[PDB]
Each structure stands twice: as C-alpha cells, then as structure tokens.
C-alpha cells in the first residue's frame, strides 16, 4: 500500500504515512531484486529482519538520476536542502527503484519547488505557494533577478534521456526510541522459562540474564525498568502482563 503503491506523491507535497500495530516482513523487501539502491545508514540491510522497531514512517516522492546520491545525510544540494532535508542522525534505509515503466509516458505531473525555502528544519513540509520571495526591494511582480517562481515542475517526455531519467524512491524513516513497538518481524516466540541462565531478547531489548518474578510494582503505563547506571533491569512481558 505504500511501497508498491499505485500513486506516488511529489517532492512538493511528499506524503507521510502512519504505520502501526502490524507485524512486518522485511524479508520480501530485501530478497526482492526490483530495488536499485538499497543503501542503509541506521540499520544493516541484511539484518533489517530480526530487530524490532517502535515506529516506522514511510516517505514517498520521485527523483531524477542525480538525487539518488544527493538524498543522504550531510550532503548538500538544490532539492536536498531547499526541498527535503534528511537529518544527519537519520536511522534508516533509503530505497529507490525504476520508474520508466509507470511514469515518463508527456507526463508533466511532478513538481519540485526550488529557491523559496532557503532554510528548512528536518522533516518539514512547505505547502505555502509563496509566488515571489527570491529577494530584492521591489515586489508584486517577478521582474528581473528581483524574484522568480520557486514552484518549477519536472517535464517527463517519452523521449527522456538516461541522465534525466526518472526514478521512484521511498524513504522509510525509523525512529529508534523506547516505547511500545508497533512493528516487528515474523518470528514466533517460545514461552517463559525462569530461574535459568538464558539468552533473552524481549521486545528487541537483547542481552543475557536470569529471568525472575519481580515484586516491584510498575505504574500501569511504564514498560521498561532501569538501573542507576541506566541499564535494563525490569521488563514487562509483552504478550501476558
């Protein structure tokens, strides 16, 4: 529904979609070879399967040939800075694939909005048209060098060259935090065994310890205990409370 979606949004208004309460098969995403670039920063591409993530956001837009390398943390560019900025500590995978089959039929649909947003904080959308604002003292017309329309659009023709050839890109934004994990991978789980030296991974915490019943009473909302040294010591069993 978001990755193999019928329609992709423009860079002008890139759609942000909530994903929750769903077990996620990352294997079909990794094994499938339709994906051109699959370079990952916060997570291993191969090990994207086992781990659990609290919240996954999927970002959708369509880019040229240059942006596949341009859309990365710490890289500077026209669209990279003026349109959609990737946080320097972004934890996730950038995913891109071919778009000749679906797009570039003349297909004039896409728009990218250049000079207007000189500075944008990360993950921010600018839906204001703002026709002028390039900079000069006069206004109310474009005039010359004084101002110009930021909202330029892509022209995709059935004759588009490989260099300007369009590509579809989907960026899944993983926010790594401690909270109830909506998405996890397709692994069934064993029951509980106590008072035994067992390698344990609870809600994806991981570690080695001895599982024992705790007399300490959580407040109902709390999920993970911790120590003076800020290491995990108390956990709430996910399936049964």
């Amino acid at each position: 529904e978001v990755f193999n979606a019928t329609r992709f949004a423009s860079v002008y208004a890139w759609n942000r979609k909530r994903i929750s309460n769903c077990v996620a098969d990352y294997s079909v995403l990794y094994n499938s070879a339709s994906f051109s670039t699959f370079k990952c920063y916060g997570v291993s591409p191969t090990k994207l399967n086992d781990l659990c993530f609290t919240n996954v956001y999927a970002d959708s837009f369509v880019i040229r040939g240059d942006e596949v390398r341009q859309i990365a943390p710490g890289q500077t560019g026209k669209i990279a800075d003026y349109n959609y900025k990737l946080p320097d500590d972004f934890t996730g995978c950038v995913i891109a694939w071919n778009s000749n089959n679906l797009d570039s039929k003349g297909n004039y649909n896409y728009l990218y909005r250049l000079f207007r947003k000189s500075n944008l904080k990360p993950f921010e959308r600018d839906i204001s048209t703002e026709i002028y604002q390039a900079g000069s003292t006069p206004c109310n017309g474009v005039e010359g060098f004084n101002c110009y329309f930021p909202l330029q659009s892509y022209g995709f023709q059935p004759t588009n060259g490989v260099g300007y050839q369009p590509y579809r890109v989907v960026v899944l934004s993983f926010e790594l935090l401690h909270a109830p994990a909506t998405v996890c991978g397709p692994k069934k789980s064993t029951n509980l065994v106590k008072n035994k030296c067992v390698n344990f991974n609870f809600n994806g915490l991981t570690g080695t310890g001895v599982l024992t019943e705790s007399n300490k009473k959580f407040l109902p909302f709390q999920q993970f205990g911790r120590d003076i040294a800020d290491t995990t010591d108390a956990v709430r069993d996910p399936q049964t409370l």
Epitope: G106, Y108, L111, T129, I131, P138, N140, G141, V142, E143, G144, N146, C147, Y148, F149, L151, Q152, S153
Partner: antibody, heavy 117, light 106 residues
Framework: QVQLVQSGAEVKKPGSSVKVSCKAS????????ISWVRQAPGQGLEWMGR????????NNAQKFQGRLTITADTSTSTAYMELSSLRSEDTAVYYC????????????????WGQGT | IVLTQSPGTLSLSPGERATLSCRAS???????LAWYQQRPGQAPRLLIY???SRATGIPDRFSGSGSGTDFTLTISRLEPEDFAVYYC?????????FGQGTRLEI
C-alpha cells in the same frame, strides 16, 4: 487546435453580475498560467487576473481589485471569471489569456490565445 | 509604468525597413519585453518574446532589440498581407500593460 468558444453577444442591465467562460481544448492543460484580459471598443486591452492552475489561486488587477473573483475548474479544464457591479457602459467584448508560468525556461509570458467572447 | 511607443503609426509602403520601437519610463530588462501582432477584429499573436528571444513558429524577418529603458522592434521587409495591429507588452513585473497599437494602412 487550441480554442476558446465565442459566446453570443451580451447586453446587461446595470448592477447585475456576468459570468464569462473560457474553454481549453487540446494540448497539455494544467501547466499554463491561464489569465484574463479585456479590450473596450476603441480602447487598448487591459489585464484583469492571473491563475496558476495547480494551486488554483488568482490575483486581481489593481484597477479591478475588489470587484472580480476569478476561479479555474481543473476538472472540466475551464477558466471562469466572475464580475459584479455591472454598469451601462460595461457592455463590451471580453477576451481570455494564457501562457506557461515557468522560469529558467525563459517563457513566463506567451500567447496561446483564442478568439474572444 | 507606461510603455511609450515610437510612434503611434509609421506609414510605410511595402518593403520598407520598419522599426516599431517601444520605450519604457524606467528600466525593465533585456529579456523583458514581448510583442504581439493582432489581426483585424481578432486576438493578438506573439512573435518575439524576452526582447530578442525569437518565438517559435515565426519567421526571422521580425526581430526585436534594445534593453534597459529603450527597446526596438524591427520589421525588415513589409509585404501586403502584413498590414495589421502590433502591440508592445511589458514583460517584467507589475500589472500587465499593453502598448497603444500601430495600425498599418495603405
């Protein structure tokens, strides 16, 4: 190829409101800055409005500011104009204008006009 | 701004080199003018845009020049079917203003 249909000639009573159409047939619509112009009989042409089709937002010429509401219906690929406070002298021929609003491609103003009302 | 043309009408026999210049009261730009040719009782048609960037679909015979506050449109070889009305049209910013028109008579 591209054309805007001519209407039947109009005469209007003072104080009413007149709606004038502008059809677009053929070519690649929704990428043009369709606008609105007019010329009184025996006087030069004067501009009234400018429409960017994608965001459907329009601006009105100073001299006509506060009297014209202009909208563009992308679904039917048409451009509409609404004029209020009609007077006796306002009966005249009314034109329609367009042209791509794209910069760094030169352009900004082009022709692609029709015939009139 | 008012775009003052030169002159209101130039009475030229066919074949004459007609410079229908147009002068601006303040600077506008060198890729900032456009000229439209209105056929009798019809709607004007673009021939030259951005002062000198020739519009596609138009013969080379028509050629605009100038920059700043003084702009020039030249018609090199008048033919009998070219009698028509020509309008200059400021292209930079502000409300669009169209020239007063030149009528070519016999």
């Amino acid at each position: 190829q591209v054309q805007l249909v001519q209407s039947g000639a109009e005469v209007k009573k003072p104080g009413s409101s007149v709606k004038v159409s502008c059809k677009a047939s053929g070519g690649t619509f929704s990428s043009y800055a369709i606008s609105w112009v007019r010329q009184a009989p025996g006087q030069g042409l004067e501009w009234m409005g400018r429409i960017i089709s994608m965001f459907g937002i329009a601006n009105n010429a100073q001299k006509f500011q506060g009297r014209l509401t202009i909208t563009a219906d992308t679904s039917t690929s048409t451009a509409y104009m609404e004029l209020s406070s009609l007077r006796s002298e306002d009966t005249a021929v009314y034109y329609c204008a367009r042209g791509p609003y794209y910069y760094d491609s030169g352009g900004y103003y082009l022709d692609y006009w029709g015939q009139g009302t | 701004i008012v775009l003052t043309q030169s002159p209101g009408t130039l009475s030229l026999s066919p074949g004459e080199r007609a410079t229908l210049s147009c002068r601006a009261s303040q600077s506008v730009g060198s890729g900032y003018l456009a000229w439209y040719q209105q056929r009798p009782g019809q709607a004007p048609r673009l021939l030259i845009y951005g002062a000198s960037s020739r519009a596609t679909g138009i013969p080379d015979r028509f050629s605009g020049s100038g920059s700043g506050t003084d702009f020039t449109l030249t018609i090199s070889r008048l033919e009998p079917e070219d009698f028509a009305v020509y309008y200059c049209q400021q292209y930079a910013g502000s409300p669009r203003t169209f020239g007063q028109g030149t009528r070519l008579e016999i």
